[PDB]
Amino acid sequence: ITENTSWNKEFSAEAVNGVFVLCKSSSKSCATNDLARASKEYLPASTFKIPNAIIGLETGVIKNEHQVFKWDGKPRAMKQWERDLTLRGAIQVSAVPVFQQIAREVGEVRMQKYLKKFSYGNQNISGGIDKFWLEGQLRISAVNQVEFLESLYLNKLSASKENQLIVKEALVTEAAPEYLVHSKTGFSGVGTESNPGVAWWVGWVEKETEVYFFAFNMDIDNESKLPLRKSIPTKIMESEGII
Amino acid sequence: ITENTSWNKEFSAEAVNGVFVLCKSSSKSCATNDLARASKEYLPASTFKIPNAIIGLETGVIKNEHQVFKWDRAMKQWERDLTLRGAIQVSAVPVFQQIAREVGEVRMQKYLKKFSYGNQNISGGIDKFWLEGQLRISAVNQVEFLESLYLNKLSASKENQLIVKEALVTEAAPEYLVHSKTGFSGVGTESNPGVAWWVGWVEKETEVYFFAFNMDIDNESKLPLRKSIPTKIMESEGIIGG
Ligand code: AUC
Ligand code: AUC
Ligand code: AUC
Ligand code: AUC
């Protein structure tokens, strides 16, 4: 891992405390704006839908790629979650309640087992089975997100290749003939000024025959600043020629 | 399958002869502008990249999803390195000719039988039967084949069906996902037109729509109608837009 000092230009303008980790081809060739923060561990928030989806499929909690998660007609925290959702839909709109129920059906024992298998952060799922990723003790770093996503990319997670392929298609966010982005956002809340929340954007880009793995997180105490989780990384990647 | 003749104005407006088949949920609920043309069989041309890629993977000719097809051509297109997805989505004639040759006639025939793929006639040369040979497939049959692929019901590993499906993703939004494939045999004349295709499926919210379009093409300028006619019909049906 190398430090790229020029990438802090993007951070300084908004007064953002954050890290971007960008790896070309594999996780052996990574660069970052902040070496210290690259392996600092933060709540995963909705980025945990990735492992959770794979585990749901692996355990049979989620039947297959075409399972519909039906809305019961009761109030949800976001209006965009108040509807029937596919697995991809639930991931893409970050429908928390769908994955809370998946996590419950998975259960603590199976959840612990798979996070050990995936080497997923501090592997600490205390804080409640339906909230450990958002309010609990689970922490993961940008470096670890890249390692995990690389494994997913190569189908090297301890899960079926079928199930890894399913979750991979659910993560597509940008598609062109020779350009494909898989990605996922995360946002833990605004916390306080003294103890800010965290915002994430993680994933990988396939450009022509090259692949780039990325993970961004930042402290956030103001919800207005949220779009910087995609705009900072995008600006960095565009400056490096990643279309 | 029901006929919806009100769609014909989208074809006549551009002075083209063609067919659109659109199915909500499954191939038991289809509609088309022209029942006769919906079951007529045409050269698959570049829509054959779907079955050819699946068969390539099934036989081991294509190693996996991360295989790179390296260039060792009168198209700039065919002098680039391509992923499997890249090769499916761009012009890559040498790649697919070579895949077909390595598969060979016996295995190719067997898989097209298993897939119920058109007239199943692979005469005309092992590396050209889908483009200038005897192979023909209807718009209805394309929808049935694509529905099978969607459901992982083709006679092929689920893994390989999933690989080829992600390579066909062409549009992505949180609750809108399009898997699609163009086809084109070349510009013909009025008497002897080429064929152009657009086939695939749209996932909108928790619904899926299977579609297949073809048209006779006798003018290079009319090629983009392969997407715009289907798009206009899907707009009118409420699939495109809210
Ligand atoms: N899985 C899951 Au989550 C959030 N926030
Ligand atoms: N495979 C395949 Au083709 C064209 N045109
Ligand atoms: N791409 C592609 Au072909 C042929 N024949
Ligand atoms: N089997 C088989 Au045959 C051809 N051509």
Short mmCIF file of C-alpha atoms and ligand atoms in Angstrom, two decimals:
data_model
loop_
_atom_site.label_atom_id
_atom_site.label_comp_id
_atom_site.label_asym_id
_atom_site.label_seq_id
_atom_site.Cartn_x
_atom_site.Cartn_y
_atom_site.Cartn_z
CA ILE A 1 0.00 0.00 0.00
CA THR A 2 1.30 3.43 -1.00
CA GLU A 3 0.25 6.89 0.17
CA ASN A 4 -0.85 9.26 -2.59
CA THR A 5 -0.57 12.73 -1.08
CA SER A 6 -2.30 14.54 -3.97
CA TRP A 7 -5.62 12.76 -3.33
CA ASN A 8 -6.15 14.85 -0.17
CA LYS A 9 -6.84 17.83 -2.47
CA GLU A 10 -10.38 16.45 -2.85
CA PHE A 11 -10.76 16.07 0.93
CA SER A 12 -9.41 19.48 1.99
CA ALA A 13 -11.93 21.56 0.03
CA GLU A 14 -14.92 20.14 1.95
CA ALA A 15 -12.94 19.77 5.19
CA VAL A 16 -13.58 16.03 5.03
CA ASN A 17 -11.89 13.56 7.36
CA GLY A 18 -11.93 10.35 5.35
CA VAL A 19 -10.00 7.73 3.43
CA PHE A 20 -10.01 6.38 -0.11
CA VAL A 21 -8.37 3.03 -0.89
CA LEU A 22 -7.87 2.21 -4.57
CA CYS A 23 -6.32 -1.03 -5.84
CA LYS A 24 -5.45 -1.88 -9.45
CA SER A 25 -5.81 -5.56 -10.43
CA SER A 26 -5.59 -6.92 -6.86
CA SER A 27 -5.27 -5.91 -3.20
CA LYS A 28 -1.47 -6.22 -3.36
CA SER A 29 -1.27 -2.99 -5.38
CA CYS A 30 -3.21 -0.40 -3.37
CA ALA A 31 -2.93 3.36 -2.89
CA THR A 32 -4.58 5.68 -0.36
CA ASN A 33 -4.69 9.32 0.75
CA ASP A 34 -4.30 8.31 4.40
CA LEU A 35 -2.25 5.31 5.48
CA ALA A 36 -3.33 5.53 9.14
CA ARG A 37 -7.05 5.63 8.35
CA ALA A 38 -6.89 2.95 5.63
CA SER A 39 -7.05 0.18 8.26
CA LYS A 40 -9.13 2.05 10.85
CA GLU A 41 -12.41 0.23 11.47
CA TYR A 42 -15.90 1.70 11.29
CA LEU A 43 -19.53 0.53 11.44
CA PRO A 44 -20.39 -0.97 8.04
CA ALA A 45 -23.99 0.25 8.00
CA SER A 46 -25.63 -0.69 4.66
CA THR A 47 -22.35 -2.03 3.20
CA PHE A 48 -23.08 -5.07 5.40
CA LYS A 49 -25.94 -5.95 3.01
CA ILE A 50 -23.21 -7.56 0.86
CA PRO A 51 -22.13 -10.24 3.36
CA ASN A 52 -25.66 -10.46 4.76
CA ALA A 53 -27.10 -11.18 1.30
CA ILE A 54 -24.50 -13.87 0.63
CA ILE A 55 -25.14 -15.48 4.03
CA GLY A 56 -28.92 -15.29 3.51
CA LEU A 57 -28.52 -17.17 0.23
CA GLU A 58 -25.98 -19.62 1.69
CA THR A 59 -28.21 -20.58 4.63
CA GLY A 60 -31.39 -20.85 2.53
CA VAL A 61 -33.04 -17.89 4.28
CA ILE A 62 -33.11 -16.26 0.84
CA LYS A 63 -34.43 -18.86 -1.62
CA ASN A 64 -32.76 -17.63 -4.81
CA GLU A 65 -32.09 -14.49 -6.88
CA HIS A 66 -35.79 -13.99 -7.70
CA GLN A 67 -37.20 -14.05 -4.18
CA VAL A 68 -39.59 -11.15 -3.62
CA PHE A 69 -39.51 -9.47 -0.21
CA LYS A 70 -43.13 -8.47 0.26
CA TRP A 71 -44.21 -5.28 2.00
CA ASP A 72 -46.78 -5.82 4.75
CA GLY A 73 -48.26 -2.34 4.25
CA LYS A 74 -46.91 -1.03 7.58
CA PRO A 75 -44.82 2.12 8.00
CA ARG A 76 -41.12 1.96 7.22
CA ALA A 77 -38.52 4.62 7.98
CA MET A 78 -38.09 5.53 4.31
CA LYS A 79 -40.92 5.89 1.77
CA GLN A 80 -38.69 4.22 -0.84
CA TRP A 81 -38.78 1.00 1.22
CA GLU A 82 -42.59 0.90 1.29
CA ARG A 83 -43.07 -1.59 -1.54
CA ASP A 84 -42.31 -5.15 -2.61
CA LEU A 85 -38.60 -5.49 -3.35
CA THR A 86 -36.38 -8.00 -5.11
CA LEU A 87 -33.03 -8.93 -3.57
CA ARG A 88 -31.30 -6.45 -5.88
CA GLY A 89 -33.98 -3.82 -5.18
CA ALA A 90 -33.63 -4.20 -1.41
CA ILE A 91 -29.83 -3.83 -1.65
CA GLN A 92 -29.97 -0.91 -4.10
CA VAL A 93 -32.50 1.13 -2.09
CA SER A 94 -30.76 0.04 1.15
CA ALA A 95 -33.95 -1.38 2.66
CA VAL A 96 -32.86 -1.96 6.25
CA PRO A 97 -35.99 -3.79 7.42
CA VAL A 98 -35.62 -6.50 4.77
CA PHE A 99 -32.08 -7.28 5.96
CA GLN A 100 -33.01 -7.05 9.64
CA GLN A 101 -35.41 -9.94 9.03
CA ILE A 102 -32.80 -11.85 6.99
CA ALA A 103 -30.34 -11.45 9.88
CA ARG A 104 -32.90 -12.71 12.41
CA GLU A 105 -33.58 -15.83 10.33
CA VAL A 106 -29.85 -16.42 9.81
CA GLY A 107 -29.35 -16.15 13.57
CA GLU A 108 -26.30 -15.30 15.67
CA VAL A 109 -24.51 -18.67 15.40
CA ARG A 110 -24.61 -18.82 11.60
CA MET A 111 -23.86 -15.10 11.30
CA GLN A 112 -20.74 -15.46 13.46
CA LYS A 113 -19.57 -18.49 11.46
CA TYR A 114 -19.80 -16.77 8.07
CA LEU A 115 -18.15 -13.53 9.22
CA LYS A 116 -15.25 -15.64 10.51
CA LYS A 117 -15.11 -17.39 7.13
CA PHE A 118 -15.19 -14.03 5.33
CA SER A 119 -12.61 -12.38 7.63
CA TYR A 120 -15.12 -9.56 8.01
CA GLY A 121 -13.67 -6.74 10.11
CA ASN A 122 -13.55 -7.27 13.87
CA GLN A 123 -16.21 -9.99 13.50
CA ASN A 124 -18.07 -8.61 16.52
CA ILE A 125 -21.82 -8.98 16.05
CA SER A 126 -22.86 -7.98 19.58
CA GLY A 127 -25.39 -5.16 19.91
CA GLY A 128 -28.41 -7.09 18.64
CA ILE A 129 -28.95 -9.48 15.72
CA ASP A 130 -30.92 -6.91 13.70
CA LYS A 131 -28.73 -3.87 14.43
CA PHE A 132 -25.09 -4.88 15.03
CA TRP A 133 -23.94 -3.36 11.73
CA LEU A 134 -25.47 0.04 12.47
CA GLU A 135 -25.63 0.50 16.25
CA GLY A 136 -23.59 -2.44 17.53
CA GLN A 137 -19.96 -3.48 17.83
CA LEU A 138 -19.19 -4.53 14.25
CA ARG A 139 -16.31 -2.61 12.67
CA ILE A 140 -14.52 -2.96 9.32
CA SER A 141 -11.83 -0.95 7.52
CA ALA A 142 -11.49 0.32 3.96
CA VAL A 143 -8.60 -2.11 3.39
CA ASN A 144 -10.74 -5.00 4.67
CA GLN A 145 -13.65 -3.93 2.45
CA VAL A 146 -11.33 -4.14 -0.57
CA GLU A 147 -10.04 -7.58 0.47
CA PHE A 148 -13.59 -8.85 0.98
CA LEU A 149 -14.84 -7.44 -2.33
CA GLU A 150 -11.83 -8.85 -4.19
CA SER A 151 -12.66 -12.29 -2.78
CA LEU A 152 -16.26 -11.83 -3.92
CA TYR A 153 -15.06 -10.72 -7.36
CA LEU A 154 -12.92 -13.86 -7.72
CA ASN A 155 -15.61 -16.14 -6.22
CA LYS A 156 -13.19 -17.02 -3.41
CA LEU A 157 -15.54 -16.38 -0.49
CA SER A 158 -16.62 -19.50 1.38
CA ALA A 159 -20.03 -19.57 -0.28
CA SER A 160 -21.26 -21.15 -3.52
CA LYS A 161 -20.15 -19.52 -6.77
CA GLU A 162 -23.85 -19.28 -7.69
CA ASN A 163 -24.60 -17.23 -4.58
CA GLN A 164 -21.59 -14.96 -5.11
CA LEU A 165 -22.67 -14.38 -8.72
CA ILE A 166 -26.21 -13.54 -7.55
CA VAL A 167 -25.01 -10.88 -5.12
CA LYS A 168 -22.55 -9.55 -7.71
CA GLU A 169 -25.35 -8.86 -10.21
CA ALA A 170 -27.35 -7.22 -7.40
CA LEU A 171 -24.46 -4.77 -6.92
CA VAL A 172 -24.25 -3.52 -10.53
CA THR A 173 -24.76 0.26 -10.48
CA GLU A 174 -23.25 1.34 -13.81
CA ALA A 175 -23.17 -0.61 -17.07
CA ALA A 176 -21.58 -0.07 -20.49
CA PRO A 177 -20.06 -2.49 -23.01
CA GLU A 178 -16.50 -2.10 -21.70
CA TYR A 179 -17.28 -0.42 -18.38
CA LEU A 180 -19.02 -1.99 -15.40
CA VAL A 181 -19.35 -0.72 -11.82
CA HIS A 182 -20.38 -2.79 -8.81
CA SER A 183 -20.89 -0.66 -5.71
CA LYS A 184 -22.65 -0.13 -2.41
CA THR A 185 -23.16 2.88 -0.14
CA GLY A 186 -23.28 3.01 3.65
CA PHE A 187 -24.31 5.64 6.21
CA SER A 188 -24.45 5.10 9.96
CA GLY A 189 -26.13 8.40 10.85
CA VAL A 190 -24.72 11.79 11.83
CA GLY A 191 -23.73 10.82 15.38
CA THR A 192 -22.61 13.99 17.15
CA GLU A 193 -19.98 16.64 16.38
CA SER A 194 -17.61 14.99 18.85
CA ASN A 195 -18.48 11.43 17.76
CA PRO A 196 -19.51 11.66 14.11
CA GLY A 197 -21.18 8.97 12.03
CA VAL A 198 -19.51 7.27 9.07
CA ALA A 199 -20.41 7.23 5.38
CA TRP A 200 -19.17 4.62 2.90
CA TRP A 201 -18.92 3.90 -0.80
CA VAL A 202 -17.30 0.56 -1.69
CA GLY A 203 -17.08 -1.63 -4.79
CA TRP A 204 -15.09 -2.27 -7.94
CA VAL A 205 -14.79 -0.98 -11.49
CA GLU A 206 -14.15 -3.07 -14.58
CA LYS A 207 -12.76 -0.93 -17.38
CA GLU A 208 -11.83 -2.83 -20.55
CA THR A 209 -9.73 -5.74 -19.23
CA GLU A 210 -8.67 -4.08 -15.98
CA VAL A 211 -10.30 -4.18 -12.55
CA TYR A 212 -10.01 -1.60 -9.77
CA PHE A 213 -11.17 -2.28 -6.21
CA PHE A 214 -12.17 0.72 -4.10
CA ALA A 215 -13.37 1.66 -0.64
CA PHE A 216 -14.13 5.12 0.71
CA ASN A 217 -15.30 6.19 4.15
CA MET A 218 -15.57 9.58 5.84
CA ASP A 219 -16.68 11.08 9.14
CA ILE A 220 -20.07 12.76 8.74
CA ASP A 221 -21.96 14.90 11.26
CA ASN A 222 -24.15 16.66 8.71
CA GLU A 223 -26.45 14.74 6.35
CA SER A 224 -26.02 17.49 3.72
CA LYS A 225 -22.46 16.25 3.09
CA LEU A 226 -23.57 12.73 2.14
CA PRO A 227 -23.04 12.91 -1.65
CA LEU A 228 -19.28 13.38 -1.07
CA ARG A 229 -19.09 9.63 -0.37
CA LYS A 230 -19.52 9.13 -4.14
CA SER A 231 -18.22 12.45 -5.49
CA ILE A 232 -14.80 12.38 -3.80
CA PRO A 233 -13.97 8.82 -4.92
CA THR A 234 -15.38 9.45 -8.40
CA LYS A 235 -13.23 12.57 -8.79
CA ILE A 236 -10.15 10.65 -7.62
CA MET A 237 -10.86 7.73 -9.97
CA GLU A 238 -11.60 10.04 -12.91
CA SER A 239 -8.28 11.85 -12.29
CA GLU A 240 -6.53 8.46 -12.55
CA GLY A 241 -8.25 7.70 -15.86
CA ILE A 242 -10.81 5.29 -14.42
CA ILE A 243 -13.26 6.60 -16.85
CA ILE B 1 -50.19 -14.84 -27.13
CA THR B 2 -52.51 -12.00 -28.09
CA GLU B 3 -52.29 -9.61 -31.03
CA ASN B 4 -52.06 -5.88 -30.41
CA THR B 5 -52.39 -4.23 -33.81
CA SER B 6 -52.31 -0.72 -32.29
CA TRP B 7 -48.51 -1.15 -32.14
CA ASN B 8 -48.28 -1.29 -35.96
CA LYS B 9 -48.24 2.53 -36.20
CA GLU B 10 -44.78 2.53 -34.56
CA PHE B 11 -43.49 0.39 -37.44
CA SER B 12 -45.34 2.15 -40.26
CA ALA B 13 -44.18 5.58 -39.04
CA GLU B 14 -40.59 4.54 -39.83
CA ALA B 15 -41.63 2.55 -42.93
CA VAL B 16 -40.27 -0.72 -41.55
CA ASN B 17 -41.56 -4.28 -41.49
CA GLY B 18 -41.07 -6.02 -38.16
CA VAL B 19 -42.43 -7.64 -35.04
CA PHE B 20 -42.35 -6.97 -31.32
CA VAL B 21 -43.18 -9.63 -28.73
CA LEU B 22 -43.67 -8.51 -25.13
CA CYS B 23 -44.52 -10.80 -22.21
CA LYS B 24 -45.40 -9.81 -18.65
CA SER B 25 -44.25 -12.25 -15.93
CA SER B 26 -43.91 -15.28 -18.22
CA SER B 27 -44.28 -16.48 -21.81
CA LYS B 28 -47.89 -17.49 -21.05
CA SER B 29 -48.85 -13.79 -21.08
CA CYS B 30 -47.45 -12.39 -24.35
CA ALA B 31 -48.64 -9.76 -26.81
CA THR B 32 -47.36 -8.93 -30.30
CA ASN B 33 -48.17 -6.51 -33.13
CA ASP B 34 -48.18 -9.39 -35.64
CA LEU B 35 -48.97 -13.00 -34.73
CA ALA B 36 -47.77 -14.31 -38.10
CA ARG B 37 -44.39 -12.57 -37.97
CA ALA B 38 -43.95 -13.36 -34.26
CA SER B 39 -43.57 -17.06 -35.14
CA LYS B 40 -41.61 -16.61 -38.39
CA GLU B 41 -37.98 -17.69 -38.08
CA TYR B 42 -35.05 -15.38 -38.87
CA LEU B 43 -31.26 -15.58 -38.74
CA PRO B 44 -30.29 -15.00 -35.11
CA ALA B 45 -27.12 -13.17 -36.16
CA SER B 46 -25.55 -11.50 -33.10
CA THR B 47 -28.33 -12.68 -30.78
CA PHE B 48 -26.59 -16.06 -31.18
CA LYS B 49 -23.83 -14.75 -28.87
CA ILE B 50 -26.13 -15.73 -25.97
CA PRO B 51 -26.30 -19.48 -26.69
CA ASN B 52 -22.75 -19.49 -28.10
CA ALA B 53 -21.36 -18.00 -24.87
CA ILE B 54 -23.33 -20.45 -22.69
CA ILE B 55 -22.16 -23.40 -24.80
CA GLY B 56 -18.60 -22.05 -24.74
CA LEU B 57 -18.71 -22.05 -20.93
CA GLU B 58 -20.48 -25.42 -20.67
CA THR B 59 -17.95 -27.22 -22.87
CA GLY B 60 -14.90 -25.62 -21.23
CA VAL B 61 -14.01 -23.67 -24.39
CA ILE B 62 -14.48 -20.53 -22.29
CA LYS B 63 -12.70 -21.08 -18.97
CA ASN B 64 -14.82 -18.80 -16.77
CA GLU B 65 -16.25 -15.31 -16.31
CA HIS B 66 -12.81 -13.69 -16.01
CA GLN B 67 -11.29 -15.13 -19.19
CA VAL B 68 -9.71 -12.41 -21.33
CA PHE B 69 -9.87 -12.82 -25.11
CA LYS B 70 -6.52 -11.47 -26.25
CA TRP B 71 -5.84 -10.10 -29.72
CA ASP B 72 -2.84 -11.77 -31.34
CA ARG B 73 -8.56 -7.33 -39.09
CA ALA B 74 -10.43 -4.69 -41.08
CA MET B 75 -12.19 -3.60 -37.90
CA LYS B 76 -10.40 -1.68 -35.14
CA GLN B 77 -12.92 -3.47 -32.92
CA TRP B 78 -11.23 -6.86 -33.43
CA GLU B 79 -7.75 -5.67 -32.40
CA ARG B 80 -8.52 -5.14 -28.70
CA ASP B 81 -8.35 -7.39 -25.64
CA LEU B 82 -11.86 -8.17 -24.39
CA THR B 83 -13.49 -9.69 -21.33
CA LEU B 84 -16.38 -12.12 -21.83
CA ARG B 85 -18.84 -9.31 -21.13
CA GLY B 86 -16.90 -7.00 -23.47
CA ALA B 87 -16.89 -9.64 -26.22
CA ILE B 88 -20.65 -10.16 -25.84
CA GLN B 89 -21.41 -6.43 -25.96
CA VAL B 90 -19.08 -5.26 -28.74
CA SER B 91 -18.21 -6.42 -32.26
CA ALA B 92 -15.92 -9.42 -31.76
CA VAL B 93 -16.31 -11.60 -34.84
CA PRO B 94 -13.02 -13.51 -34.52
CA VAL B 95 -13.80 -14.48 -30.90
CA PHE B 96 -17.20 -16.02 -31.61
CA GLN B 97 -16.12 -17.74 -34.82
CA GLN B 98 -13.30 -19.36 -32.83
CA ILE B 99 -15.61 -20.31 -29.94
CA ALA B 100 -17.95 -22.03 -32.40
CA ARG B 101 -15.07 -23.87 -34.11
CA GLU B 102 -13.71 -25.14 -30.78
CA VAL B 103 -17.19 -26.26 -29.69
CA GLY B 104 -17.60 -28.09 -33.00
CA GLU B 105 -20.72 -29.33 -34.79
CA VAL B 106 -21.66 -32.28 -32.57
CA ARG B 107 -21.61 -30.39 -29.27
CA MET B 108 -23.15 -27.30 -30.89
CA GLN B 109 -26.03 -29.37 -32.29
CA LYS B 110 -26.59 -31.13 -28.95
CA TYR B 111 -26.85 -27.90 -26.96
CA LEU B 112 -29.13 -26.19 -29.49
CA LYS B 113 -31.43 -29.23 -29.29
CA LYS B 114 -31.37 -29.02 -25.47
CA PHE B 115 -32.12 -25.28 -25.65
CA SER B 116 -34.93 -25.74 -28.22
CA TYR B 117 -33.19 -23.02 -30.21
CA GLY B 118 -35.13 -22.17 -33.36
CA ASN B 119 -35.06 -24.64 -36.24
CA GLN B 120 -31.87 -26.12 -34.70
CA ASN B 121 -30.28 -26.16 -38.16
CA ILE B 122 -26.57 -25.46 -37.93
CA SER B 123 -25.81 -26.15 -41.60
CA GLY B 124 -23.79 -23.58 -43.53
CA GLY B 125 -20.37 -23.73 -41.84
CA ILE B 126 -19.50 -24.20 -38.16
CA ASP B 127 -18.27 -20.61 -37.78
CA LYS B 128 -21.07 -18.87 -39.70
CA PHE B 129 -24.33 -20.86 -39.50
CA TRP B 130 -26.09 -18.24 -37.35
CA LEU B 131 -25.21 -15.41 -39.74
CA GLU B 132 -25.13 -16.81 -43.27
CA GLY B 133 -26.17 -20.43 -42.67
CA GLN B 134 -29.47 -22.23 -42.17
CA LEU B 135 -30.16 -21.39 -38.52
CA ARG B 136 -33.46 -19.56 -37.96
CA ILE B 137 -35.31 -18.53 -34.77
CA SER B 138 -38.58 -16.71 -34.13
CA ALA B 139 -39.32 -13.80 -31.80
CA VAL B 140 -41.57 -16.10 -29.77
CA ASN B 141 -38.77 -18.68 -29.49
CA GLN B 142 -36.32 -15.97 -28.39
CA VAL B 143 -38.68 -15.06 -25.52
CA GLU B 144 -39.00 -18.72 -24.48
CA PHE B 145 -35.23 -19.20 -24.57
CA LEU B 146 -34.61 -15.97 -22.64
CA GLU B 147 -37.24 -16.85 -20.04
CA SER B 148 -35.48 -20.21 -19.53
CA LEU B 149 -32.17 -18.36 -19.11
CA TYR B 150 -33.81 -15.96 -16.64
CA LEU B 151 -35.13 -18.88 -14.56
CA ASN B 152 -31.87 -20.86 -14.87
CA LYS B 153 -33.79 -23.64 -16.62
CA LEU B 154 -31.51 -24.05 -19.64
CA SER B 155 -29.59 -27.33 -19.80
CA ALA B 156 -26.43 -25.71 -18.46
CA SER B 157 -25.00 -25.01 -15.00
CA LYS B 158 -26.72 -22.24 -13.05
CA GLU B 159 -23.24 -20.74 -12.64
CA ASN B 160 -22.76 -20.40 -16.41
CA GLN B 161 -26.28 -19.03 -16.93
CA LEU B 162 -25.58 -16.41 -14.24
CA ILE B 163 -22.22 -15.52 -15.82
CA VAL B 164 -23.82 -14.91 -19.22
CA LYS B 165 -26.69 -13.01 -17.61
CA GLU B 166 -24.39 -10.47 -15.94
CA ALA B 167 -22.63 -10.01 -19.30
CA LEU B 168 -26.02 -9.03 -20.81
CA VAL B 169 -26.78 -6.25 -18.31
CA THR B 170 -27.18 -3.05 -20.33
CA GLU B 171 -29.12 -0.70 -18.03
CA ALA B 172 -29.06 -0.53 -14.23
CA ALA B 173 -31.08 1.46 -11.72
CA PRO B 174 -32.10 0.57 -8.17
CA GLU B 175 -35.45 -0.90 -9.24
CA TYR B 176 -34.90 -1.18 -12.98
CA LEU B 177 -32.55 -3.68 -14.60
CA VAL B 178 -32.28 -4.50 -18.30
CA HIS B 179 -30.64 -7.57 -19.79
CA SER B 180 -30.55 -7.20 -23.57
CA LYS B 181 -28.81 -8.19 -26.76
CA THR B 182 -28.79 -6.63 -30.21
CA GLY B 183 -28.57 -8.61 -33.43
CA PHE B 184 -27.85 -7.60 -37.03
CA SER B 185 -27.12 -9.73 -40.10
CA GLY B 186 -26.13 -6.82 -42.33
CA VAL B 187 -27.88 -4.30 -44.57
CA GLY B 188 -29.82 -6.02 -47.34
CA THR B 189 -32.00 -4.70 -50.16
CA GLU B 190 -35.78 -4.24 -50.31
CA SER B 191 -36.08 -7.58 -52.10
CA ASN B 192 -33.58 -9.34 -49.81
CA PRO B 193 -33.43 -7.48 -46.50
CA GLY B 194 -31.09 -8.25 -43.62
CA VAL B 195 -32.54 -8.76 -40.15
CA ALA B 196 -31.98 -6.69 -37.01
CA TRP B 197 -32.93 -7.80 -33.51
CA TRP B 198 -33.29 -6.51 -29.98
CA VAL B 199 -34.08 -9.19 -27.39
CA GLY B 200 -33.92 -9.45 -23.59
CA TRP B 201 -35.90 -8.72 -20.46
CA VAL B 202 -36.74 -5.76 -18.26
CA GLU B 203 -37.00 -6.09 -14.50
CA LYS B 204 -39.08 -3.20 -13.16
CA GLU B 205 -39.70 -3.26 -9.41
CA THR B 206 -40.83 -6.87 -8.84
CA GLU B 207 -42.15 -7.47 -12.35
CA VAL B 208 -40.29 -8.98 -15.30
CA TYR B 209 -41.04 -8.32 -18.96
CA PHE B 210 -39.56 -10.56 -21.68
CA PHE B 211 -39.18 -9.04 -25.13
CA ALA B 212 -38.05 -9.84 -28.64
CA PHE B 213 -37.96 -7.46 -31.60
CA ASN B 214 -36.93 -8.06 -35.19
CA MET B 215 -37.22 -6.07 -38.40
CA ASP B 216 -36.20 -6.28 -42.03
CA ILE B 217 -33.36 -3.83 -42.69
CA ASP B 218 -32.61 -2.44 -46.13
CA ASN B 219 -31.20 0.91 -45.03
CA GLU B 220 -28.17 1.45 -42.79
CA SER B 221 -29.79 4.54 -41.23
CA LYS B 222 -32.73 2.52 -39.84
CA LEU B 223 -30.64 0.29 -37.56
CA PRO B 224 -31.36 2.28 -34.35
CA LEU B 225 -35.09 1.58 -34.75
CA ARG B 226 -34.31 -1.87 -33.31
CA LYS B 227 -34.17 -0.13 -29.90
CA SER B 228 -36.42 2.88 -30.46
CA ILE B 229 -39.49 0.95 -31.68
CA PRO B 230 -39.42 -1.40 -28.68
CA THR B 231 -38.72 1.52 -26.34
CA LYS B 232 -41.72 3.46 -27.66
CA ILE B 233 -44.00 0.44 -27.26
CA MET B 234 -42.67 -0.20 -23.74
CA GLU B 235 -43.26 3.49 -22.96
CA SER B 236 -46.87 3.18 -24.17
CA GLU B 237 -47.32 0.08 -21.99
CA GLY B 238 -46.11 1.91 -18.87
CA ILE B 239 -42.86 -0.04 -18.50
CA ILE B 240 -40.65 2.93 -19.35
CA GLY B 241 -41.33 5.92 -17.10
CA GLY B 242 -43.60 6.33 -14.08
N1 AUC C 1 -27.58 -5.78 6.38
C1 AUC C 1 -27.88 -4.68 6.59
AU1 AUC C 1 -27.68 -2.99 6.98
C2 AUC C 1 -27.92 -1.30 7.27
N2 AUC C 1 -27.80 -0.20 7.59
N1 AUC C 2 -22.00 -15.86 -31.96
C1 AUC C 2 -22.41 -15.07 -32.69
AU1 AUC C 2 -22.66 -13.80 -33.82
C2 AUC C 2 -22.95 -12.64 -35.07
N2 AUC C 2 -23.44 -11.97 -35.88
N1 AUC C 3 -19.44 -10.62 -32.30
C1 AUC C 3 -19.64 -11.50 -33.02
AU1 AUC C 3 -19.79 -12.56 -34.38
C2 AUC C 3 -19.73 -13.52 -35.81
N2 AUC C 3 -20.01 -14.23 -36.68
N1 AUC C 4 -24.83 -34.00 -34.19
C1 AUC C 4 -24.54 -33.27 -35.02
AU1 AUC C 4 -24.39 -32.12 -36.30
C2 AUC C 4 -24.06 -31.03 -37.59
N2 AUC C 4 -23.86 -30.38 -38.51
#
